[PDB]
Design a protein around this nucleic acid. Structure first.
Lengths: 149, 60, 206
RNA sequence: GGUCCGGUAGUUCAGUUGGUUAGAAUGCCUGCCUGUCACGCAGGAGGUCGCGGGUUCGAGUCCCGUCCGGACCGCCA
RNA sequence: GGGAGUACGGUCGCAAGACUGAAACUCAAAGGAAUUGACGGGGGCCCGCACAAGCGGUGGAGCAUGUGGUUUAAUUCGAAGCAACGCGAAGAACCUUACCAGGUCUUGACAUCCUCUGACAAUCCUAGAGAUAGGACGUCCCCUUCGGGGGCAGAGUGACAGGUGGUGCAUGGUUGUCGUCAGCUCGUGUCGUGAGAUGUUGGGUUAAGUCCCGCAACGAGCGCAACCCUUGAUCUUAGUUGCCAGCAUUCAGUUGGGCACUCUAAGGUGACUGCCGGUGACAAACCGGAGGAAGGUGGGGAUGACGUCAAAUCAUCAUGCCCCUUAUGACCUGGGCUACACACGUGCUACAAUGGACAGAACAAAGGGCAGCGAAACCGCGAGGUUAAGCCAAUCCCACAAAUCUGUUCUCAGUUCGGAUCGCAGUCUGCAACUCGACUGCGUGAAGCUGGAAUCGCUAGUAAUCGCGGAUCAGCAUGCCGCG
């Protein structure tokens, strides 16, 4: 017991734009180094071709469109199993958004991983992703059960 | 029936395969160590008692 | 189950192997040879009490020292029996042997001799209370820092075995800096088998 | 003795009408839960239709007869 | 104490019932108050991958292994919730092996003695698994004032020997478990009468009965921590079978040189809330900094208290009973311990394009090696075969690490996935590969397209994946142990 938190895999400290930050480090939650970073770079590029503008710009726009603010937790009080919504801490927010990004990136089912993640970047920059769908799902269900607190 | 078979162990059989190893201090046929020709329980007894001039209890 | 043996734990860090020699590619038969020679002295000199024996293999000619104080009669007019036992040893080991005897002062606080003693009056049918109690007071009169004695088996009550102990002073088995000396002896009586264990704490080692 | 009813998984009832599919609880078996047992949770099989005969491409279910039970009636002197 | 405020009989009552009130029979207790424990779907605090937060799994499939059930001549025994079930067994073709079928023997597989021959069996032919039958050196040593003794067997005999023949509920010696939990107790003294209490409770604090302050307790012990090992940073010593820095020369430190550096391994130095600031009564501590390789027991290991499970082990040991010597004791061969309608567990491998195939490029640690490791080279497609160098090893060998990265191809399917099971031909080992070993080249190619109810492990070099050693060992490892 006792809340702890820790840094992991942060890039070089000075002049850390997020594009060089995730160019040299960051995200990489696919497995091991090697066939996790190469593929991420390829996905990142196949969207500069698709939309001729900044890859990291549309990437954090996609992340922003994925960003939730409400998440519900269950409770044992009462024999009806009520569920209570709470505000999401920002670290939980970013890791959970990135988690859904990667899981329906591998779930969305195209012929290969780089175009899968590329189409996921496009479909999260625009609001037509499965992750955007479930984001609004938990948002509206939290708004539905928000009466409890 | 234990001790007829250890007599079978020292006196030689007819083929080079049949020399199954044994520990003669305590006659277990299983789990002897070639470095000492000695099996587990009677190894551990004299090991804690002091012999086998270089054995110490490991910790790393 | 039980503890580990204190002296088995302390082998090599505080304790000697009492087999200080080295063999390589002859380790095996050398080793079982130290076992049967120890057996020979153990059941030959059981009358005059022996605790431990150190074996040296200088130039493969075996060399022996034997401890404890009651073999002061072995050293004495029994130089003849010293020679005879040594002739039997060279009869057993091929390459000959040379033996020495070391007197022990305060033989009361040596674990092997204590355990052999308790086994002896347990065979002689004194009560285990009396045996343990006079022995423990004798050791801590001798100057031991702390002594705990064990007994287990059919302690008169043949229908159910149990265990009994008495101890005072300090017996820090958990401290490895401590000097401990452990014995076990097996007292045989008409009731079956009676187990004796004893260990002695004799101050720490700086 | 006459008339009318029904005869279905081990048990109890649907299907028996739809001539053209044999089902539902319970029981039983296996797995899960429990310290164990019971509850509770996942899975699964079974009958081939009281019997015999006849019609039809095809009868559980149509039509006779046999057997088993049940209901009703067996009255006037 | 029940029987029982029941039966009977009276007395009231409208009635329900009320009052009065036995016995037979039966039990050896029932009770009151208090103590210590345990428990509570009682309360107050605290911890532990205990749950949460996640990650990867099992059960869905095949295969390996253990177990149950069934069967057999026997499927040798023991293990049974955690805390039995890749468990003894760190390796079953005979052996192991105990079990079964058959063929055998009886002072005996074997030990101590007795009495004789006295040194003795070996070795090859005949039937032949034992073992018998006859020959061949065949029963032949050493000390011996050479009389006779000793060793070292043979023959014969009687005391005896042998029991994995049961009993962990007779046992010793062992081991797991709660639990690495912070508890467990004692001397002396008080209080109660006694059971017992106080110490060990209260306030605060800690990983901790850790510590501080209180307090009829004062102390002490087993505990806890430290002391040990290893891993982290550095100094000195010593530079070869290691290192290559400045040098010169090579295919390569290879050499010529040299311990500089790495490293080796000894001796050391270092971390102790040490210091600062703050909180806290100033106490104990707590919080944050500076330093520091390391900071609050740095990490990990070893280390298992009193006890609990009448836990297990009569398979190391041993009174106790029982087994016989015309057998529960020996010998031998063959079989069995590997069976198979099913179930359970633990593992391995897959279901695929974060992939598969093909080519290339690399980068570890830790061990082992003499009836052993066995180099290079040659042969063979390959398992391997042949002559063989070196190494008892910081020289030599095992020994080409894999995952990884770069490129080409495959193009989403039961597939260039997956390899199950089979047929054929071989390799090694071993007297021997059928029951019943492993490996190779072939051909064939299974189910399986992420798995119900459920359920498990895991707080960072961890999980998850990747290979590599060792033991056991003729040959056999998906298991175990350890390494990066």
């Amino acid at each position: 017991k006792g809340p702890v938190a820790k840094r992991d895999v942060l890039p070089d400290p000075i002049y850390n734009s997020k594009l060089v930050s995730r160019l040299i480090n960051k995200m990489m939650i696919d497995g091991k180094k090697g066939k996790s970073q190469t593929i991420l770079y390829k996905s990142f590029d196949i969207i500069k071709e698709r939309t001729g503008n900044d890859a990291m710009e549309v990437f954090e726009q996609a992340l922003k469109n994925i960003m939730p603010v409400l998440e519900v937790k269950a409770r044992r009080v009462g024999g009806a199993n009520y569920q209570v919504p709470v505000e999401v801490r920002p670290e939980r927010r970013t890791t959970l958004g990135l988690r859904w990004l990667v899981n329906y990136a591998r779930l969305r089912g195209e012929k290969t991983m780089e175009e899968r993640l590329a189409n996921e970047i496009l479909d999260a920059a625009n609001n037509t992703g499965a992750a955007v769908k479930k984001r609004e799902d938990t948002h509206k269900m939290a708004e539905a059960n928000k009466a409890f607190a | 029936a234990k001790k007829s078979m250890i007599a079978k162990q020292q006196r030689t059989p007819k083929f080079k395969v049949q020399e199954y190893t044994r520990c003669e201090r305590c006659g277990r046929p299983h789990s002897v160590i070639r470095k000492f020709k000695l099996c587990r329980i009677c190894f551990r007894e004299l090991a804690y008692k002091g012999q086998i001039p270089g054995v110490k209890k490991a910790s790393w | 189950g039980q503890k580990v043996n204190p002296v088995g734990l302390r082998i090599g860090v505080i304790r000697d192997w009492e087999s200080k020699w080295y063999a390589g590619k002859d380790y095996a038969d050398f080793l079982h040879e130290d076992l049967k020679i120890r057996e020979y002295i153990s059941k030959r000199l059981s009358d005059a009490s022996v605790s431990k024996v150190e074996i040296e293999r200088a130039a493969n000619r075996v060399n022996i020292t034997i401890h404890t104080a009651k073999p002061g009669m072995v050293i004495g007019k029994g130089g003849s029996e010293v020679e005879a036992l040594r002739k039997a040893l060279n009869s057993l080991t091929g390459k000959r042997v040379h033996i020495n005897i070391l007197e022990i002062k305060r033989a009361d606080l040596d674990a092997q001799l204590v355990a052999d003693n308790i086994a002896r009056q347990l065979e002689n049918r004194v009560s285990f209370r009396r045996a343990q109690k006079q022995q423990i007071q004798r050791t801590m009169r001798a100057g031991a820092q702390g002594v705990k004695t064990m007994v287990s088996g059919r302690l008169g009550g043949a229908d159910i075995a149990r265990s009994e102990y008495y101890s005072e002073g300090t017996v820090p088995l958990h401290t490895l800096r401590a000097d401990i000396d452990y014995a076990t002896s097996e007292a045989d009586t008409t009731y079956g088998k009676l187990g004796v264990k004893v260990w002695i704490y004799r101050g720490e080692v700086l």
